[PDB]
């Protein structure tokens, strides 16, 4: 997922925001 | 806002900045 | 180990180090 | 919660393990 | 997104995450 | 400036984008 | 507690969290 | 003072420490 | 040692604790 | 260079950057 | 010590070099 | 430049100081 995506390729803050409660 | 390459505690820091008082879950694969 | 004030970013970093692979949740409003 | 337990007062690394999945 | 107190190092880190490639300036005295 | 806007008072990620080149 | 992969200032941060008011020495090879 | 290998937000942190109240510009290539 | 071990392979917090005073 | 309040983690990070290869000691209770 | 010299009061990068090995 | 130099090879704090205002 995201942890892997942000770290192995790249991610946007908007994608991260999907992890907020 | 730009794309970011984000490993280890940098990921969790960015989640902290982006989510704030809403909080978040940190769910790494295995 | 020991007892420190962990605020903001510092708290999530500490959770990252403590929990690692397991993952964690950060829920200020609770 | 965690913020109360750790920032205003203090907590141990062991208490922080309460918030691990 | 959200509103937090960002002081010292924390402010420049947040600028790094927000601005990235673009770069930024950090000018306390202004 | 930025220090006044963010440390003493509070700011959004969007305000911080004011200081991007 | 889990294993951690820890480079640069992340190592020193973890020592700070683990050692606290007891302190520590940071002794890199050469 | 020693040489340092410095990537991502670590670079910006070091600039913050070295420059202080003088501030700085962060100017990455493209 | 530890710096090299934690960084090149991995280490536990319990191993780190060997570096406390 | 410059003069800042460096507390907690921030102090050890600064020592890491300043001392690097040499290593350092962090002894709060002294 | 260092905590007194740097957190409560202020210190320079040069003073911090006092704590290098 | 510096960002690339500090990250891909190494740089001194004295070199960084060239980026201060
Ligand atoms: Cl890193
Ligand atoms: Cl803080
Ligand atoms: Cl702080
Ligand atoms: Cl702090
Ligand atoms: Zn890092
Ligand atoms: Zn802090």
Residue boundaries of the structural domains of chain H: 1-30
Angle of helix E9-19 versus helix B9-19 axis, rounded to 10? 90
Cα G14 from Cα L4, distance rounded (Å): 27
**Most distant CA pair in chain D, distance:** 24
Chain H residues close to L18, C-beta within 8 Å: none
Cα C5 from Cα G17, distance rounded (Å): 11
Tell me, yes or no, if G6 comes closer than 8 A to chain D by beta carbon: no
Spell out the residues 6+ positions from residue I13 whose beta carbon is closer than 8 angstroms to its own. C1, C17, C18, D13, G1, G4, G14, G18
| Alpha helix (H) residue ranges in chain F | 2-3, 13-16
List subunits contacting chain L, requiring 3 or more Cβ pairs under 8 Å.
Answer: H, J
Beta bridge partners of residue A11, listed in sequence order:
B4
Cα C11 from Cα B15, distance rounded (Å): 12
Beta bridge partners of residue G4, listed in sequence order:
I11
Interchain pair B18, E3: CB under 8 A: no
Please give the distance, rounded to the nearest whole angstrom, from the Cα atom of residue H8 to the centre of ligand 3.
19
Cα B13 from Cα J29, distance rounded (Å): 30
The method of structure determination was: X-ray
- The closest CB to that of H14, out of J4, J17, J19, belongs to J17
Give the dihedral sign, CA G27/H2/H4/H10.
positive
Give the dihedral sign, CA F12/E12/D13/K8.
negative
Collapse the DSSP code of A20 into the 3-class scheme (helix H, G, I; strand E, B; otherwise coil) and give the result.
strand
Q: Between chain H and chain J, how many beta carbons pairs sit less than 8 Å apart?
A: 25
Closest by Cα among K12, H20, E13, E18 to L21:
H20
- The closest CB to that of J24, out of K3, K6, K19, belongs to K19
Q: How far is CA H7 from the centre of its chain?
A: 9
State the DSSP string of E1-30.
Answer: --EE---THHHHHHHHHHHGGG-EEE-TT-
Interchain pair H8, E23: CB under 8 A: no
In chain K, beta strands by DSSP E? 11-12
Q: Between chain B and chain H, how many beta carbons pairs sit less than 8 Å apart?
A: 3
- Residue L2, both tokens: 């510096």
Interchain pair H9, B5: CB under 8 A: no
Q: What number of CA atoms fall less than 13 Å from residue L10's CA on the CB side?
A: 8
């Amino acid at each position: 997922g995201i942890v892997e995506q942000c770290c192995t390729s790249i991610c946007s803050l908007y994608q991260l925001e999907n992890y907020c409660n | 806002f730009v794309n970011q390459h984000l490993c280890g505690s940098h990921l969790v820091e960015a989640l902290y900045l982006v989510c704030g008082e809403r909080g978040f879950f940190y769910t790494p694969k295995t």
